[PDB]
């Protein structure tokens, strides 16, 4: 594949858990967009269990006709790290989710992916 | 300034709303992190009044010990675009906000300023 991202994401979209998981250094962090942190820090041996939850939530909405779409990796200047924008698009498509992770990547393998999202609100606070 | 995203953040530093707002392209784009599109689109002349409301709300968490940083901005492969990451934390420092700007330029102008942020759970 063109990169490593690449690869996560062929892997991913295609079911192959244990291919995607395995794009992750040992000492890797996957960074979710929601937790206490803010967001949550998964490990190596704890992304597997992620990516299983993720697949079955991808079969989900792949069954209601929504597309999930992840846009080719675009490099900072620092040449190991990436941005990924996505969404998840009705077959219609109208926008339910969308977000961006940026990558670390080290020796051919992910580092760090860290995961930002929209939030879906009526509305926060202003003034 | 060493770019237009630079300038935006240093006048936004100095209380200068105007010049901040002054970095966007009549066509720009501010997009919220949150919102029902998901997120919320506002427009150039909108984006005034989020820098007022920002500027405040940046002096509160300065009293209250809060300490917000900006990161340097990265620039992308593609010149026109850049990632700016941000964070807030309390005073013990627990961060209780964290995200990043993706932004979009224009022939030295802001066209897109797309935000993005964890959601903080405890």
Redesign the interface.
């Known amino acids: 594949a063109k990169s490593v991202i690449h690869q996560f994401f062929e892997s991913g979209a295609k079911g192959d858990v244990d291919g995607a998981w395995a794009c992750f250094a040992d000492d890797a962090v996957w960074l979710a967009?929601?937790?206490?942190?803010?967001?949550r820090t998964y490990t190596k041996t704890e992304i597997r269990d992620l990516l299983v939850q993720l697949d079955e939530m991808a079969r989900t909405v792949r069954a209601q006709g929504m597309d999930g779409v992840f846009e080719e990796p675009?490099?900072?200047?620092?040449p190991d790290?990436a941005?990924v924008?996505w969404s998840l698009r009705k077959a219609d498509g109208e926008?339910?989710?969308?977000?961006?992770d940026?990558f670390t990547l080290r020796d051919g393998k992910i580092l760090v992916k860290?995961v930002?999202?929209?939030?879906?609100?009526?509305?926060?606070l202003?003034?």
Do not use: M, N, Q, Y
Request: without cysteine; hydrophobic residues 40%; aromatic residues 6%.
């Open positions: 967009s929601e937790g206490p942190e803010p967001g675009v490099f900072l200047t620092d790290k941005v924008e926008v339910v989710d969308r977000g961006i940026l860290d930002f999202r929209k939030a879906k609100l009526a509305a926060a202003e003034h």
